[PDB]
Every structure is written in C-alpha cells, then in structure tokens.
C-alpha cells in the first residue's frame, strides 16, 4: 500500500514557504496516514535542503534523483517563475498502489516525457490521478501544454480539476461540459470544484455534487482527501480499476464530501495561525 | 369528472435488517398520488392473480383508484429485489377497456421494457386525440434493458408527449456528455409544452416555450419523493385548467408565472408526501 | 468625456401612465449615479414627449437634437402592445462619446435599427459599445431578421448584459450560459448575464464571475446595466483607449463590477 | 421429409434512374430460393401484399419451389425498397406462431431480424425453434442501416446468442465495433455459443471459425455483393445439410465440426456463390 | 485551387564517387501532385548553394512553385547511406499562401525543431479553408528524442484529415499492436480516412464507413509518397478536398476510398517502373 | 564445436506404424541439414530400436539415460504415452535447445523441462513449439500455464494458427503470437496454413506468402527456421542480443528458407 506522487517541488517567495502543488498532494496524503514517495527535482541549496526537511519532517520518502537540479525552482509572487523539470526516466519504487502527478511536471519538458512515459510504465499496477493545476504564468506554449494535458486526461483513471483550469483548457465552454468530456475518455472519475460553489463531480453512474462550503492549497488539500477516501474506500490499485469505474454515485457524493471539508479544514487550520 | 389514466408497472419491492415488502412501481404511486389529491385516475397495469397481485389491487382500491379491467393477467406479480434484482414481466392489452381520458401517464420500465412497451407507445398515439400526454422516463437504476434501445424507446416517447418530468440522474444516463439542462432543452424542442428537471437538493427547473422557470430545493426515497412530486405537477396543471387535447394549445402556451406555481406546487406535494410519511 | 445611450423613450399604459423605455432608463440610471450623459431617441412633440423630456433633464440626462421629431410618441400598453415608430438621424450631432450604450427595440425595429448599427461601427474607434437586448416580442417582427439583428450587434459590442429570459428566447434549445460564452468569443470583452434570484453570471477572457442573488423585472435590470456600466467606467476600463484593459479584466475585477451592478440594482428597487 | 424454414423480408427492390426496373429481393428470400434450388424443401415465413407487387413475388417463390407459409400475405400493401438515395416503403410484421411443423432448420436475418414489430416474433420463433431446428443468422446490416440510420447493434448481438450457424461481411462487423478488425468480432460471437461463425471477406475470399479452429478459403478471380452473400449463405447451409450437421439431434456434432469439414462447407459455400453469379452473366 | 506542400527539400547521397539525387518525401509528393496536373506551392528550407540551385531546378522543371522564404537555409540538408542526415529544418510560422484547398506534410518536417513548431502553426492557420494530410515517413536514423518525436506524430494526427503510413512506420510509432490496431486508433482521433500501405501485401485504409483494401501490384526509393500523391490527386478530382467538402470527405463511402487506393497504388507502381526505366 | 539440443518426445504412430514425435522430427530435421544434434526423449523392445535406429541412421545422437521407457510411447488420436526425464542429462552446454509438444506440457517431465530451459539459457538459444495434440487428456489449465511459462523463457517461438487458436480462441492468432513476442523472446514464428507464414522481432514483422502434407511439414519448417538462424550466426547465449536484434530483412530470409524447407521436405517424399 504505497502511494507515488510524482511533480514539481518549489519555493513560494511573496517571505519564503515550501510549495508545489504535487508536493502538497504527497504531504497531504502522508499527513492523513498513507505511505507516499514523491520523485521531484529539487537543488542541494538552502531551498533544497528546506524543501527536503519539510519533506522529511512529513513522512514522505523523498525518491533518490530528486535532489539533482542546479538550482532549486522558486515561484515568486500573477507568478514569475525560475523552474527546471528533469527526472530519471528509470522506475524508482516497487510497482505503487497509486500513481499521481499534474500542474508544472505533466506538461513541461524535458521532464513531461518522462512522466508520461512512466505513467504508462506503472499503469497495469497502479491507479492514476492528475490535477492539470493550470499555471498559465510558467512560460507558454499554450497549444502544447493544453494538448499535453488532454492526453494525460485520456490516461487518467481519476482527476480533479477546477472551474478556472477548464476555462484556461476551453472557454467557450461551461467547465461541467469540458468535465463532462473529460470523464467520457476513459476516467472513472473527473472531479470539479467550484470555489464559493461547490463541488461537482461525475462517474458513470451519475453526477455527485457537494454545496458551498481562496488561499494557497485548498486545491491540493482536496485531491489528497478525494485520493484518501477512495483509498480507504477499497477502489485504488489496478486490481479495483473495474470497480472504480463502477463506483456508485452515493460513494462518489460521500468522497467529494470528504475532500470538500479535508480542503476546508486544511483552510481553517491555516486561517487560525 | 374527467378522468385521468396512467399505464405502467405495479409490483412488490422486496427489502432484504428486517425483511418487509412494500408496494411500489413509479406509475403505480403516480396514480395513487393524483386519486389522494382528489383525481379520479384509472390504473392499466400487470400483476398476477396471487398474494402480492391481491394487495397491490386492496391498496389500489383502498386510495381510490380503479384498476383498469385485463391488469390481472401475469403469471406472477412483478417484484424487485433489494444487488437490486427485478422479476418482472411488462405486457398489457392493445386495447384497454378505457373511455377517452383527459390524460394519459406512463413511464419508467412500462415505457422501455418488452413487450408492453410497444402497445404503451401506441396506446400513448390513440390517446392524444383526447388526452394531454405526460411522460416520466425514471430509469431504473437496475435498467437491465440494453442502453442504447432504452435511449430510442425513450426519446420516441419524448416525441409524443406534452409533458415530460426527468431527474438529473436521469437525464445524465440518457447522456452522460451534456448537462442535464442541455438534455431537458432539446426535449422541449421535440414537440413538449412542459419539460421539468429535478436537481435533487437544488431544487427543480422547467423549461416551456415562453421561457425558463425554477424553484429553490425544500429542507424519503428519491424515487417515492419524484413521483409525489410529478402527481403534484399535473394536478396543478390540471388545476390551471390546461389539460386535455382541447386545451394543449393553451397548455404549449403556458406562461413562466404559471410554470414557476406549478413547480413550487409540486415541490410542496412532493415535500409534504415525505414529510407526513416520515412523521409514520 | 461623456456617455450616449442610442435607443427608445415611451410612456408605460397600465391596464385598465409612467415614463418609460429601457435605453431610457439606463441614461438615467448613469445620470443618477453621476455621469454625464447624452439620450438619442425619438420623442413625438406632445404632452407624452414633454413629461419625458422633463424626467430627462430632471434626471440629469442631455436630450440629443434631431430626437424630438417623433410623428406620435410611441407608446407601451400591459402583455404588451406596443403604437410604436423607431427613427434616427443618419448622424448625430455629439462629439465622440467615451461609451456607446444601445439595445430592446431600437436595436431590432425598423427603420431605426439600421442606424443604430452604423453608428455603433462608427463610434467604436472613441467609444466602448454596450448592449442589452432586452427582448420584446410584442411588438412583432420577422423572428429570423430579429435574430440577425441581435447577433450583428453582439459582434459590434464590447459589453453585453442579457437575462436569462432574453437568451431562451434568442435560441430556447441552448441554456443560456452556452449562448452567453459563444457571443463572449464573437469579439465583446463581457458578457453579463442576470439569472433572476438565481443571481448574475459574467464571462470574460480570464474567466468566470458569478455574484449570488437577493442583494420591477426590467425596471431592475436597466439599473443593473446603469451599475455595471457605472463601475467599469469608474474603474477606467471604458473608452476605445482602454479596450485592451477590457479585455483583459480580471475575474476580481468582473466580480466587483457584478457585485456593485446587483446593488446598484437591488438599491433602485428598495429606494422605490 | 426434413424441411428448412426461413424467416425474413420478400420485397420489391425498385431502381429510380435510367432504365429503371423492379426486381424480386428479400436477402431472406433469396436464401430461400438459393435453398430450394439446391433440391432442400423450404418453407418461407415472411410478410407480402395480396397486390400486383405481391403475386409477383408469391408467382417467384413457387417457381422456385418455396412453399410461402400462411399468414404470409397479410401486408397492406407489399414491402419495397427504393434506390434513387434509398428509401424504404416497408413493414415487418409475422404472426406469433406460425402453422409449421418442426423444421431441421430456421433462418433469419437482415431487416427482418432488426424490425419493429415482427423482430420481437423473430426473436422468440428461434427460443422456440431450436430444440428441434439449427438456427442459422446473416445479419446483412447494409440493407437495414439504409432503412433505420438510427439501428442499434443490440438487436442483433441477441440473435448472436440464439444461432448456431452465423454468417456475415467484413463491413456488417466493422459496423459492430469499427475499432477491431473483423475477426476480432467473429471470435467474439463464436464465443457466445455459435458451432460456426463464417466471415465473407469481399474480393479476399472467406473465413470461419468453430472450437476445433479457424479454416479459410481464397478469393475468387472473379457485384450484386448482396445477391452473392445470399447464395455463399444458401450453399454453407446446402452443404452442412448434405455433411448431416443439421437438426438439433446433430448440434453437439456441429459445434464439434472438424476444421477440414468447415474449411470443405467454405469451399462449396464460396463456389456456390461464384457460380450463382456467373450464370447470372448470361 | 492550389495545394501547398510544407516539408523538406534535400539531397540523398549514395554509399560508394557516389552520386547525388533530388529529394525529400514532401518534395516528392509535391512533385507528384504537379506530374499529375494540380497546381502546388512548395514551402521547404535549402540553401543558396550549389545543391539548393540544383533542388530549385528540380522543382522549377516539375512544375512546382517554391514557396518565398524556402532558400534561407545556412547549407542544403543532405541524407547518405541506413541512412546519416546533415539537416536543418526552421521555417516562417507566418502563412505564406492565400488559403490553399489542401495542406500536406510529414515525415521530417513534421517531427524535427524548429520548423515543426511553425508547421503545427501552419496548419492550425490554414485548417478552416484547407484539408488537411500527413504522411508520418518516419525516418528513425535521425537523431532526435523518440518520445517528443511520437507526440509531435500525434499532434499532427488529430489534426489531419487524410493520413497514410507504411506498416513499418506505425510498428516504429506503436510495436506492440498490428499497425491495423494503430490505424484504426488513429482514425479515432479525427481522421477521415487513414491510409496503410503493406509492401508486397498491397495496402489498406479506414473510413467511417468502413475498410478498403487494393490486393499486391504485380512490379523502391519514393513509392510511398508516389502513393500520397495519387492517392490526394484522386480525392482532389472526386470532389473532397477543400474544409467546405471537409464532412463530404468524412462520409467517403467504401467504394470511392477503394478506387482512391486502386489509383495511388497504380500511381506508385507507374512511379518505380518509370525509375527502373531511367 | 556447436551441438543442438532437443528434449521431447519420440513416439510410434499407429495408423502401419511410422516413427513419429514432433521434436524427433525437428532433431531429426536438424541432422538431416547437417547439424550436430542430441536428442534426450524416453524410449527398449521392438519400436525402441525400431525409433533408435531410426534416430542414429539420420545422424542424432542419443542421450544416455533416454532408453529407460517400460514401452515405447503410442499414437493410434489415441495416446499411450508416459513423459519422464533425468532432472540433470549428461550433456556438455549446447547451443540451442529445443523443446515442445508433449514434452512441455506432460507429467512428470514437463516439471524437469522449465527449469532445465533456465539453467541452459547461459549458454544456449532456447526455442519452443507448443505443437498443440490435446486428444492427450489434462487439465488445459495447467497445460495452458505450462505453455506460458514456457514462453517467458524462450528465445525463438514457432506455432501454428490452430496451436494458438487452442490457447486463446478469442484473439486473433496474430495478437497472441505478438503478446509472447512481449515476455521476453527475440522472434515469434507463425505459420498460418495456405496463407503462408509470418514472424515478430523487436524491428518490426515479416512475411512469406503460401507456397503452390503431413505435420511433419510444421516440425520440418521449425528445423529450416534453426538451421537457417544457426547459419546467420545468431544462435548461442553470446549471441543472443544479436538475436534481438534480427533485421526484418534477416527474419525475411529465415522465414523463407523455413518455408522452402518445409515444402521440399514434403515434395521430397511424393
């Protein structure tokens, strides 16, 4: 039962904090009590070595090759970033029950070849996961990262995404209709929030939606909760992937409950200090 | 008295706690809704001549709704089993012992299920001379019936109807890549006056050809609750004096104040059936 | 640096007199909120044209010249029937306006309508374009032409607001957040669109903007175009020179903009 | 004394454009006629006017030795089938049960196997059939696309499983699932419960499967592609009938079929066809 | 109505005093089109050297008109023989060309930096007036990264309307499904048709409406884009080429898309007898 | 220097009785070609001496410890049969070993077979031909199982359609042949009756058209395939990467000179 996360760890400069959107999935999840590994690509600085403590002081194990980069990526504060994304091709970790990745990692190069290559190497053993997290101020190419972002959809079993990242995909849609089209190319799963609306989400068997319950995370803390439920629902692993699919709409519903108030707690928590 | 006629299947659902045995069938509680709100309905359906076909007919009689005469005819009284298993046949007369009604209701499995559903889709054509046509498509969530004949049969009923009530759970396993309101739109475009939309917690939505029309959701079964909520839908529609072949031009132009009382009438039916029922 | 609204002024006949029209009304809901505005119209030279012209400059609001030559002023009687003639100068006597606001008849009844959009091409180059279609049926026409009418409006706009009611008309068999996000790709920069208790929606390049509800039908929906007019005008987006600022507004930006739109609103109908 | 019954559309094929003319058709009907020709003893159950089209096609198929079941001629007005564009001016309707002794063998197909009302008839007629009878399928869903655009794939998947003898083209499976070639699809089927699932494969021959494995025959060096299906289906049916595989007494034998008797049945199905064409040359 | 080729123009270079010949696969199916009577732009990237005067030639005399902005190359890109390139590919991103009826490209246009950028562009600029085909031509020996050079394939397949590769082409795209699996995925991601060519086993192609298959021509270097050309060159006279026939095209029937194989496979054969002539 | 190994079965088939036994056949094809071959199978009385002498006047050599059968295996199909083998056979490390047929699949042998194929591959090409006779009664379960493990440790595969179509009815023969292309060996040949043959490696397929017959004509195809890939000098575990690496050019020619073999051998005996 372990989990592997694979994507960008940074520093978020305004004052310095730790950060990366698929770094906060794998502390997310290894706070709620899983094993994780996460493959990243950090520096041997003094971000690097934060970056690695506050990985460490978490109980993720931290996958060797992570620490390679010249310099460790930083997205400093409407966001400029300094980033590079490279990781060993080579599998790193026993076949996991999860794989999981998204924003920077899924769609910048050279290290997006590697990713992509290597969801398709644990796919037949673990369930897969993306969060598209679009980060339109990381450089450009927007044809090539929306394209490159519609083919890890169509390797995805599982994906949340948010109404702004389905509007930066496709505005001349409603996001629940790009949603909608995204769960019709494989998924079991495609998750949407809403903001101060909710949170919807769609399976074969039905729509499910949670009411209305904006600070750095919420959106990650949410995937880590949605991964946690279905993990503890008995749904991930290649193994289950015929019944992920078939997951019912009371147990989907029940799921984005549990991810809607992880992020909200994670929120609240964070308000209080 | 106008009488109202609804077809569709009457059965037992069979709850495997402590075992009970409750009557159901969507049209079944459609008739039985609109005869406690003081309609005079007929009920064409099929059931055995047993045990459980007996109580379906004392409870039938009991709320005053009259059993249409060729219902009785099954081997076996239909039944489901809750793993949500169905035994279950669904044939009926081509041609029902039945004065003109001024409308007519069918839905659910009667609609799509072999062979009753093709003598339904006919009997729904012969009708509409004299009788608004209202439609409930209430996919079983079971639906063992092929997918893809379930979405024809549907949508030809949809063609011959004047009014439709969906759910968005419906309307999504009609077709998962278009939000329901999509769906429930190119419904009205096929010939409905009235086509209504249940978004569970979020209330209700309707559309006609003057416009849209919506109701705020309500503070025990979804599918009981959709059924109190379409018998309060064409008794208010009833009320409103639009139905009837004589009045479904009147009907099609049914205004958005009219449309939004009918829903918030049916949105009250239907809390209030749950309400009263929860207070046993 | 002043505002013109293009469109229709009338009396409203209750069933069984208050002035009236919606073009009107967004004139004098940017002159309440302190703007200095210019109404183009058509106004008979009667007891009708003379109440209007006085709640006009009561207002605030500057009558254009050449708007007072109406053959009868046109009339709106509850349903409603509409004794009604929509005409125009080929060209206006105003200097460049900062903002262009049409809309409802003026924009689909002949023969008007076919200055209206010229000179809407024409102002574009000083001004920021605004419309509400604002739809009336009542008052008949060819149904198709209508339409046509509309959406070569909507790719001359900038700023579109419309309700729900107004889209379902335009085209029933879409919801109306559809046909809002294929008239936003035509070339506006926003298109706002009221959903009744429901609340508003806004789409712009950025993305979505939504504000939640509670907070006279058409009455309050000119006073809701007034507001959201209003505030882009004072957050200095308005004018042909800050159309790439338009287009680019932030959802924090649209949601503000919403925000004092639905107040300004919701304000006229408790005042009143 | 053994019979075959067929099951299935006699129609009048209409050609609209220059020398325009009307043929006898039916794919059910001509594997009728195919069988009757062969020497088999036929019964068609199918569904015709008592007008000037239909005593044209009843005058046909006595002719050719088919007996026309009862209740055959009950039709408004008699079936056609237009070609301009094509259009349909067609109903499918047969009574529940039939007055027929218990066949060795029924087949079935093409738009009456797919077609409202009659097709539910169909369905239940082969349940009912088969404890005596082979049931044998040509689905030929070229004709039935062309009359209902809208046909779904459901309706034939559950002859599937009623058959014991299936044939059909390359494009009737690449309409089934255009994402797998076609033998794909008729491995599929065949592990549904066929004995034999034969593939006519246009101008590269033929193949068939059954449990013992696949046989195959080459193209011939020689459309009307429909009318030739028709007769490949009546010669693998002759020659299956001849090989004593027919009748449900046999049915564990013909699912037992050898590959060198399937790859024979191919053969004399494959030149029955060929030369059910050439004589059609002159 | 004008085509407009976008790819690249070289020369090969046998093994041995070894001899020099005009090339290049997108070249070559612009030639082909010309030889076949239709008008074709040529946008390539060749020297003002001795060799990209010689390529100029070459397309002067076919009939070819070369695209302005095509001779800015430092040198003109060479092949010899397995084969070794000495090749440069950037090309304007700016169209060119009033809108042509049909834009076609492949092989190492397609997959190869910078130029492939612009060609996506090029065609994404051109798709509404223009349909749109690809030949994938993979040419491995190229040293590039294989997996940016299968998702650079891929974008160019889901926004084609006519593809046609070689089994050998999709065994290297895809090895472990037979390339009528490849095919048939790519003719699922908006292909109208997708055209398989199977050496001595003739060729095959997928439509909406079903396969096609031409048997083995009873008869080496260019067959195949002497096949696209004949094979564009008869969709161009049934009337399905041009966005405004682009759902025309979708609906090809089974029978038209075989005659479209039987003529680009007897335009490919006419092509190597004439060689083997010469 | 260089000896092949075969390990099989060596049969009497009764239809008159004729020395029989696929991979018999292919040892005894593999001589007849002019290779070194030893044969260890399971053989003492008159059908022993009768296949001894058959297997020694073709040039194979015997391995000591294979004449220890109570009788010589029976095919009438009708199979009186026992499979028993030495876990270790006095054999110096050959080149290629070749196994298949009942030998792969049959108890008790078959058990010794699979780890024998482990600790030859150091130094020998492992091929394999299931060469499927399932009138040999056992559960096809395991037989199924026996085959694939079978597969994950050879190098060179040949099978026929109908082999393949008894292993997994509902896939293409194709499909199958190019998923045991995946688990590890270096060229699946399948041969595909009146429609000639074809063959997987890593560069991509080829294919030999049918050629204007006993299954002798199968195992005389296998010994042409060996022999012709032996002749390329791609047989042996040094030359195994090599083997991977076979163009399709190469596999072409192999595939033709198997097919050409297999059709000589039948002309050649009417």
């Given at each position: 039962?372990?989990?592997?996360?694979?994507?960008?760890?940074?520093?978020?400069?305004?004052?310095?904090?730790?950060?990366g959107s698929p770094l906060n999935v794998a502390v997310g999840l290894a706070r709620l009590g899983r094993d994780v590994?996460?493959?990243?690509?950090?520096?041997?600085?003094?971000?690097?070595?934060?970056?690695?403590?506050?990985?460490?002081?978490?109980?993720?194990?931290?996958?060797?090759?992570?620490?390679?980069?010249?310099?460790?990526?930083?997205?400093?504060?409407?966001?400029?970033?300094?980033?590079?994304?490279?990781?060993?091709?080579?599998?790193?970790?026993?076949?996991?029950?999860?794989?999981?990745?998204?924003?920077?990692?899924?769609?910048?190069?050279?290290?997006?070849?590697?990713?992509?290559?290597?969801?398709?190497?644990?796919?037949?053993?673990?369930?897969?996961?993306?969060?598209?997290?679009?980060?339109?101020?990381?450089?450009?190419?927007?044809?090539?990262?929306?394209?490159?972002?519609?083919?890890?959809?169509?390797?995805?079993?599982?994906?949340?995404?948010?109404?702004?990242?389905?509007?930066?995909?496709?505005?001349?849609?409603?996001?629940?209709?790009?949603?909608?089209?995204?769960?019709?190319?494989?998924?079991?799963?495609?998750?949407?929030?809403?903001?101060?609306?909710?949170?919807?989400?769609?399976?074969?068997?039905?729509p499910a939606s949670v009411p209305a319950q904006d600070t750095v995370g919420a959106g990650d803390a949410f995937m880590?909760?949605?991964?946690?439920?279905?993990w503890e629902q008995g749904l991930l692993g290649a193994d289950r992937r015929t019944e992920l699919r078939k997951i019912?709409?009371?147990?989907?519903?029940?799921?984005?409950?549990?991810?809607?108030?992880?992020?909200?707690?994670?929120?609240?928590?964070?308000?209080?200090?």
């Amino acid at each position: 039962a372990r989990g592997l996360v694979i994507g960008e760890a940074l520093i978020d400069i305004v004052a310095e904090y730790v950060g990366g959107s698929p770094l906060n999935v794998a502390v997310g999840l290894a706070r709620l009590g899983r094993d994780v590994d996460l493959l990243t690509h950090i520096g041997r600085d003094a971000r690097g070595r934060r970056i690695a403590e506050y990985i460490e002081s978490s109980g993720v194990q931290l996958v060797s090759g992570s620490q390679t980069a010249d310099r460790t990526p930083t997205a400093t504060a409407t966001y400029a970033f300094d980033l590079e994304w490279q990781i060993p091709d080579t599998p790193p970790v026993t076949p996991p029950l999860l794989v999981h990745t998204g924003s920077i990692a899924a769609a910048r190069e050279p290290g997006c070849l590697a990713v992509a290559a290597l969801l398709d190497a644990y796919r037949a053993a673990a369930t897969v996961s993306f969060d598209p997290n679009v980060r339109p101020s990381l450089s450009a190419d927007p044809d090539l990262t929306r394209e490159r972002i519609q083919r890890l959809v169509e390797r995805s079993d599982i994906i949340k995404a948010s109404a702004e990242d389905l509007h930066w995909i496709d505005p001349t849609q409603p996001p629940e209709q790009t949603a909608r089209a995204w769960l019709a190319c494989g998924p079991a799963i495609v998750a949407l929030t809403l903001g101060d609306q909710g949170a919807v989400a769609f399976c074969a068997a039905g729509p499910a939606s949670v009411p209305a319950q904006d600070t750095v995370g919420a959106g990650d803390a949410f995937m880590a909760g949605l991964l946690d439920t279905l993990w503890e629902q008995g749904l991930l692993g290649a193994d289950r992937r015929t019944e992920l699919r078939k997951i019912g709409v009371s147990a989907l519903t029940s799921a984005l409950e549990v991810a809607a108030l992880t992020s909200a707690l994670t929120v609240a928590r964070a308000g209080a200090d």
